[PDB]
Design a protein around this ligand. Structure first.
Ligand code: NDP
Ligand code: NDP
Ligand code: 5WB
Ligand code: 5WB
Lengths: 165, 165
């Protein structure tokens, strides 16, 4: 019924860890560069907790915050309270990026068309996970090794998957 | 319609610069060794400006120069005036390397099957750029850090991507 591409944008470790103590368990500025370039010009859909840890709108993109709080407001951002309200806000968009965290990934899981996953080859301590997905009917359409150096101290790969049917 | 693999061979910086003042912005003799070893035994397809800065045929490869000039001739080199004429000349080749510069990379962009791209981790001043490419349905099949030493004073990586669909 919705006409936008619904894409997930996530970085996770060997055990699907995405967070520890309401923050990111790793610092990978080069991974952040990839995220910025990939998502630029497209709406970012984020759970309230994800957004609040950021604390400011990310420039050049529609920032849409998902919350059950019907009195929630933040300047420079739009607020939605359900999947359908996100779909109404983004009805004429080409592609939107579900940007996390875990509760918001779970929420949009039935609707994902395309997956941009950074896979980090380390096992971090963590408490928040990317949902399991059955990847049948999914095709890897891109893979490349991430930049590992003094500023980016882990091995990681960018993967992109597209849903077939 | 054509049966040869159409490969690109290019070195570019962090902003896709490949040239400044009709020359290469950097000196990387080790990168040139990789170029020789990779292309040897296969046709090099070069724009007229690229070739003329070289000024002589590169040994052990068919040198094919692309120009609109129907009276253009160079000893030890073959001359083509269109994509189709290159395809005619190379119809029985296994693989050909589009060798630049930017106008010639633009020209053959719809036909590229394989990308050999060196990425230099520096921002040079430049005036000539490698075209943007949507890497959907391409996979990185090779990556290696280039040699950085007194003779090769930048950080760079060899990447090879192959088109899937
Ligand atoms: N590595 C990565 O790729 C990413 C990791 N993260 C990490 O994930 C963690 C945060 O994730 P998590 O704790 O799951 O929180 P989320 O970011 O998913 O936000 C949860 C909030 O979203 C709102 N929400 C959840 N479900 C609904 C619903 N059905 N309808 C309306 N609103 C809803 C609620 O807001 P409210 O309480 O206001 O009602 C809820 O508290 C952090 O550790 C963060 O660092 C985040 C993004 C990416
Ligand atoms: N870093 C790298 O990997 C490389 C960098 N370079 C750099 O690129 C620069 C040169 O590139 P650029 O200036 O774009 O020039 P090119 O090497 O692409 O050559 C331009 C010439 O190609 C011919 N040409 C262009 N389009 C067509 C067409 N449609 N049909 C027939 N002939 C055509 C024309 O020749 P004519 O005028 O005779 O008609 C034109 O002048 C230099 O700085 C060089 O150092 C070059 C190769 C590799
Ligand atoms: C944009 O900058 C940030 C983003 C996030 C967000 C995310 C993400 C995110 C990342 C990093 N990588 C991928 N592949 N997908 C994602 N969805 O939550 C961790 C938190 C930040 O610090 C609080 C950020 O710094 C300002
Ligand atoms: C081979 O020797 C040369 C080649 C080129 C060519 C190129 C290239 C080229 C390079 C360097 N690296 C990669 N990865 N791809 C390419 N296509 O144009 C700049 C110019 C030269 O001097 C002006 C060369 O010295 C004789």
């Amino acid at each position: 019924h919705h006409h936008m591409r619904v894409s997930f944008m996530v970085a996770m470790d060997e055990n699907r860890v995405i967070g520890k103590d309401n923050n990111l368990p790793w610092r990978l500025p080069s991974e952040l560069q990839y995220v910025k370039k990939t998502t630029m010009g497209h709406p970012l859909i984020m759970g309230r907790k994800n957004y609040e840890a950021i604390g400011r709108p990310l420039p050049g993109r529609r920032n849409i915050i998902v919350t059950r709080n019907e009195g929630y407001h933040v300047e420079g951002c739009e607020v939605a309270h359900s999947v359908e309200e996100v779909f109404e806000l983004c009805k004429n968009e080409e592609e939107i990026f579900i940007f996390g965290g875990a509760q918001i990934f779970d929420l949009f899981l039935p609707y994902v068309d395309k997956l941009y996953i950074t896979k980090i080859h380390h096992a971090f301590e963590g408490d928040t996970f990317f949902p399991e997905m059955d990847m049948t009917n999914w095709k890897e359409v891109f893979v490349e090794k991430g930049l590992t150096d003094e500023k980016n101290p882990y091995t990681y790969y960018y993967h992109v998957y597209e849903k077939q049917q």
